[PDB]
Amino acid sequence: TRKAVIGYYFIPTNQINNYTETDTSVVPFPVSNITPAKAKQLTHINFSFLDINSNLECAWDPATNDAKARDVVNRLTALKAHNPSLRIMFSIGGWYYSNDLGVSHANYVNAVKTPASRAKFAQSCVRIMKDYGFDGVDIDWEYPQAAEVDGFIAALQEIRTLLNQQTITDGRQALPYQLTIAGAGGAFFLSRYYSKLAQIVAPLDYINLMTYDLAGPWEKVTNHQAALFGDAAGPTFYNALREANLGWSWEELTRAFPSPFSLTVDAAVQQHLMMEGVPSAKIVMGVPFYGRAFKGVSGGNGGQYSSHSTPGEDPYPSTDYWLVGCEECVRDKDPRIASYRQLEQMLQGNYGYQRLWNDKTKTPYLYHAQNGLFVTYDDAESFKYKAKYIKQQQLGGVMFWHLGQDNRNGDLLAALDRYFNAADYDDSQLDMGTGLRYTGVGPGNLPIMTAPAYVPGTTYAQGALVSYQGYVWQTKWGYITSAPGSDSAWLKVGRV
Amino acid sequence: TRKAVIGYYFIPTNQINNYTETDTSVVPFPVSNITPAKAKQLTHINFSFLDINSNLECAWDPATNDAKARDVVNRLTALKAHNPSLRIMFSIGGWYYSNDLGVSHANYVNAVKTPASRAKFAQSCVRIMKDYGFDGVDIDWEYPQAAEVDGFIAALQEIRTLLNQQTITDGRQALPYQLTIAGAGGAFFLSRYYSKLAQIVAPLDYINLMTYDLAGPWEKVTNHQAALFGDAAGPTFYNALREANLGWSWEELTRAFPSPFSLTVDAAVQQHLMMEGVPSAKIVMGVPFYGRAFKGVSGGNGGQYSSHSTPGEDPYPSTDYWLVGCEECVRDKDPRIASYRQLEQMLQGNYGYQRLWNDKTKTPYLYHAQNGLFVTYDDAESFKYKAKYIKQQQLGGVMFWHLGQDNRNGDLLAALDRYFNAADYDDSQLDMGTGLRYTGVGPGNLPIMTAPAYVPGTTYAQGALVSYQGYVWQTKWGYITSAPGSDSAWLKVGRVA
Ligand SMILES: NC(N)=NCCC[C@@H]1NC(=O)[C@@H]2CCCN2C1=O
Numbered sequence: 001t002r003k004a005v006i007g008y009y010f011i012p013t014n015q016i017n018n019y020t021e022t023d024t025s026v027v028p029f030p031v032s033n034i035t036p037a038k039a040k041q042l043t044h045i046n047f048s049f050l051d052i053n054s055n056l057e058c059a060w061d062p063a064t065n066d067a068k069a070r071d072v073v074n075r076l077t078a079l080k081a082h083n084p085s086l087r088i089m090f091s092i093g094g095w096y097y098s099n100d101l102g103v104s105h106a107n108y109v110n111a112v113k114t115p116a117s118r119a120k121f122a123q124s125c126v127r128i129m130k131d132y133g134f135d136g137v138d139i140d141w142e143y144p145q146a147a148e149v150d151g152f153i154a155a156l157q158e159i160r161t162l163l164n165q166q167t168i169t170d171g172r173q174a175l176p177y178q179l180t181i182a183g184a185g186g187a188f189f190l191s192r193y194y195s196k197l198a199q200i201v202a203p204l205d206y207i208n209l210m211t212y213d214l215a216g217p218w219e220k221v222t223n224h225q226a227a228l229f230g231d232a233a234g235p236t237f238y239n240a241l242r243e244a245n246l247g248w249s250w251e252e253l254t255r256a257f258p259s260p261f262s263l264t265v266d267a268a269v270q271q272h273l274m275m276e277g278v279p280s281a282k283i284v285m286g287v288p289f290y291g292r293a294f295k296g297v298s299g300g301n302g303g304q305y306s307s308h309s310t311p312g313e314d315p316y317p318s319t320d321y322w323l324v325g326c327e328e329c330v331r332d333k334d335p336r337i338a339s340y341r342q343l344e345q346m347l348q349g350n351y352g353y354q355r356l357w358n359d360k361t362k363t364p365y366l367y368h369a370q371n372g373l374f375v376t377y378d379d380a381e382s383f384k385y386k387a388k389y390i391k392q393q394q395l396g397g398v399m400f401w402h403l404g405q406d407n408r409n410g411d412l413l414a415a416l417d418r419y420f421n422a423a424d425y426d427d428s429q430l431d432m433g434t435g436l437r438y439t440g441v442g443p444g445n446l447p448i449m450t451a452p453a454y455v456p457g458t459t460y461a462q463g464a465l466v467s468y469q470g471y472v473w474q475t476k477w478g479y480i481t482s483a484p485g486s487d488s489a490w491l492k493v494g495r496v
Numbered sequence: 497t498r499k500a501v502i503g504y505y506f507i508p509t510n511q512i513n514n515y516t517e518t519d520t521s522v523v524p525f526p527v528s529n530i531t532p533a534k535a536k537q538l539t540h541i542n543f544s545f546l547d548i549n550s551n552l553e554c555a556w557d558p559a560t561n562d563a564k565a566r567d568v569v570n571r572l573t574a575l576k577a578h579n580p581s582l583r584i585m586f587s588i589g590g591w592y593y594s595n596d597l598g599v600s601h602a603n604y605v606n607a608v609k610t611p612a613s614r615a616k617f618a619q620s621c622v623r624i625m626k627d628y629g630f631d632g633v634d635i636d637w638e639y640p641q642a643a644e645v646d647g648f649i650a651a652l653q654e655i656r657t658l659l660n661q662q663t664i665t666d667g668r669q670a671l672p673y674q675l676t677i678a679g680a681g682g683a684f685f686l687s688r689y690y691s692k693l694a695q696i697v698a699p700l701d702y703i704n705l706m707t708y709d710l711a712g713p714w715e716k717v718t719n720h721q722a723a724l725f726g727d728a729a730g731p732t733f734y735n736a737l738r739e740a741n742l743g744w745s746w747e748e749l750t751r752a753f754p755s756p757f758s759l760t761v762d763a764a765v766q767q768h769l770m771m772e773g774v775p776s777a778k779i780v781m782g783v784p785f786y787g788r789a790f791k792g793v794s795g796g797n798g799g800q801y802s803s804h805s806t807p808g809e810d811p812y813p814s815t816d817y818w819l820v821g822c823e824e825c826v827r828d829k830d831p832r833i834a835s836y837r838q839l840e841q842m843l844q845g846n847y848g849y850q851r852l853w854n855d856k857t858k859t860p861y862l863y864h865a866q867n868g869l870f871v872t873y874d875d876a877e878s879f880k881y882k883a884k885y886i887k888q889q890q891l892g893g894v895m896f897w898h899l900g901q902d903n904r905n906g907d908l909l910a911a912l913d914r915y916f917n918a919a920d921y922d923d924s925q926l927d928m929g930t931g932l933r934y935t936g937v938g939p940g941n942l943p944i945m946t947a948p949a950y951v952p953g954t955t956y957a958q959g960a961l962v963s964y965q966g967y968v969w970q971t972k973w974g975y976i977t978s979a980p981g982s983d984s985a986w987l988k989v990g991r992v993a
């Protein structure tokens with residue numbers, strides 16, 4: 001099965017309202033930049049972002065010029081002429097609109113509240129999809145909280161019901177309408193809805209993990225924002241999942257959620273695979289087409305794992321654009337984020353940056369020894385290991401933010417496509433390294449094991465293993481006189 | 497309120513059937529050994545044991561001569577003439593009958609299954625109670641677990657309803673019929689029903705904790721079987737309550753159930769107190785009137801916390817009776833258990849035992865340097881600390897197993913009564929020691945705390961404390977923008993006044 005390659009196309013309301021493909025000063029990345037070749041390397045483009053309004057319906061920014069919006073969307077759907085598998089999805093939400101303190105947060109909470117609010121909301125998503133010509137719905141609420149999760153799940157189920165009906169009504173069996181969400185790629189936010197992951201993923205074609213922004217100026221020490229595996233020399237974090245609303249025992253929580261742990265892409269993927277009912281084929285690994293920069297770092301590990309003096313607030317609370325050579329940072333008034341396109345230009349500009357590589361995390365980073373700057377980012381090299389992991393772990397594919405950040409030749413996208421699809425690319429010998437793997441074990445990823453059938457009437461010693469009801473169990477202490485599932489002394493440790 | 501003093505009177509079916517008060521080789525402990533003085537020192541006598549038959553009703557062992565059974569019980573209820581507060585309870589169950597692998601275990605599981613079975617069983621308990629002249633029902637199922645607990649709770653509730661009505665019918669308001677159970681005194685068995693303790697205890701007058709047998713040959717390291725407090729030098733154990741179906745977070749489980757921990761009497765009592773809705777007044781501390789012996793122990797620490805070579809199978813699989821001076825052990829065929837009566841004799845018999853004391857656990861022990869023996873037991877001195885604990889912790893009283901093991905003068909029973917009631921006993925200056933106390937805190941026994949009210953729309957740093965919906969909450973990590981409650985970021989740490 002072809003791996004999904006999902007790229008976000010984000011365009012601010014002012015750029016839509018002033019849309020032009022001939023003046024990068026107004027619209028830095030117009031649709032025309034997505035050439036036929038690039039359209040063929042994508043399976044999905046997530047047009048972003050739409051929102052949920054006070055009327056609790058899916059809707060465009062109230063300030064959007066609808067006729068201009070329709071034309072931009074039509075340009076995107078026109079790309080399907082070059083790739084019959086291409087889908088132009090539209091994304092609802094994003095951090096700005098939906099975070100707990102975001103401008104539209106209450107609308108998300110209220111829209112999933114009742115059977116009626118959900119029906120109205122689901123209907124609006126499908127109506128918007130059909131009216132503008134989109135191929136599916138992607139919801140990026142960052143993020144529903146424990147008490148809102150059942151409502152969220154029910155809303156997704158409703159949209160799924162309506163989309164499947166629309167697929168048949170439109171004769172779209174060959175390319176069914178889809179439903180996806182952008183899911184948390186870090187344990188802290190993930191813990192909000194983790195316990196009900198299976199129910200959340202059931203109505204989805206994919207859950208696209210935001211497995212990046214795992215480091216930022218909001219953290220005390222610099223770190224890689226999307227390390228594939230862990231580096232023992234780097235910072236470790238509290239494993240929030242042990243506090244998720246699971247109802248599991250201490251042994252179960254402990255074995256599934258070691259703490260502290262390394263916040264990496266592998267951790268997030270493995271945490272999802274640990275839940276039963278969450279299929280690897282629906283998990284999509286997100287990757288960033290941008291880097292995060294920090295100032296005020298010290299030497300010793302090339303800028304890595306160092307204290308820093310970078311403001312963590314949004315918007316950037318200063319006028320000091322200190323990321324040397326980053327012209328896009330001046331345009332966007334924030335030196336803490338730089339597109340791969342800009343970083344590549346900074347590297348060939350002799351600005352004082354050294355490109356270094358961490359072979360544990362399998363990610364590159366820049367160090368500016370003169371100015372004390374550190375940049376964590378991803379590139380065509382880190383993408384080889386992530387692509388191999390996606391294939392080995394049988395994931396659904398890759399997602400990335402965002403298309404306008406790739407370089408002019410579309411090298412990052414081309415690399416992802418190459419790694420999955422090129423007949424002459426062979427990563428059989430690619431060394432995945434010795435970085436730390438997440439070793440938690442849960443209901444969903446128990447190892448295959450064998451053990452004698454449990455025998456009623458037998459008394460078991462501590463550490464004994466038996467098979468019962470299709471799983472292998474081990475005793476937590478001795479003199480066990482009742483059965484697995486009915487005596488708490490038994491721990492499920494394997495399957496089959 | 498007077499503290500309860502609940503003593504078991506256990507008599508095997510063969511002794512009932514050949515009951516005699518003039519031949520200790522047939523009946524070692526006849527009822528006649530309970531004088532008026534002893535009757536006045538007790539508040540309850542738990543006659544044991546009755547069972548639950550295949551008809552799922554309370555019943556005597558089928559092999560019991562009924563007339564002889566009534567005569568033994570009559571000797572016990574006649575003691576009431578000497579103490580108007582005394583109750584002769586009858587106990588249903590016990591280890592032999594009710595353990596998972598016991599001969600009658602199925603009957604316990606099936607009797608509590610449905611409204612009909614529970615009604616039938618509860619009616620039979622009250623019928624036996626009235627027919628034989630008992631003053632209450634005590635159930636000692638060791639122990640219900642899983643799906644059985646809800647049924648058990650409903651059966652207890654049903655018996656309570658029937659007893660209360662019987663009390664009114666009989667005009668027994670001055671000494672109402674009572675309902676109690678023997679409860680696990682250790683976390684492993686306690687974990688079976690721990691999550692529903694409040695519901696189990698609601699219909700009871702008392703839950704009598706079997707806070708003994710916390711050490712035994714079944715364990716690789718010798719230890720005190722009923723330490724009041726812990727000795728950091730002794731063995732520690734996995735806290736099984738961490739595995740009960742409580743629905744608590746990892747932090748809550750860890751805070752409530754330190755692990756490994758010292759299996760002590762204080763741990764069991766504190767573990768019950770940690771659960772919301774379990775009143776200290778209903779908690780009864782059990783104590784043993786017998787000791788457990790180990791052979792093959794090493795020198796150095798008086799036989800304490802040493803490897804040993806003591807058989808663990810039951811029955812005692814050997815014919816070797818190695819507990820020096822213990823002839824009772826010969827009569828009963830097991831050198832691993834001895835009554836306080838017999839142990840006291842071994843101490844007056846110049847057999848080479850040293851009586852030592854652990855000032856952390858507040859318990860005595862015997863050490864036979866010559867033969868490599870260790871005996872853990874309780875005596876009048878250890879009962880001083882336990883009785884003071886009962887008073888300080890406002891527990892309902894003390895329970896013990898069993899009356900036949902006290903010495904002929906009834907000194908252990910006399911000591912307990914004295915510690916609770918004698919005007920001439922003063923423990924105000926008795927030092928409880930520095931042994932390890934159980935310090936778990938449960939979401940159901942949080943301290944009063946004070947914090948600013950939670951402000952919606954605020955972002956909280958790690959470790960911040962706020963008050964919200966009756967509790968004080970602490971954040972487990974930073975940048976918290978969610979409200980306290982089920983949300984993973986917040987931990988209930990205190991109660992708002
Ligand atoms: N200015 C900053 N931080 N840019 C990085 C934006 C990362 C971007 N934010 C989002 O909310 C969407 C949700 C879907 C995935 N997204 C992103 O990667």
Ligand SMILES: NC(N)=NCCC[C@@H]1NC(=O)[C@@H]2CCCN2C1=O
Pocket residue numbers: 589590591592636638678706833897
């Ligand atoms: N021979 C031995 N092991 N004697 C110790 C028996 C302890 C005794 N056993 C039980 O089942 C009753 C239930 C009520 C309290 N019990 C005991 O202490």
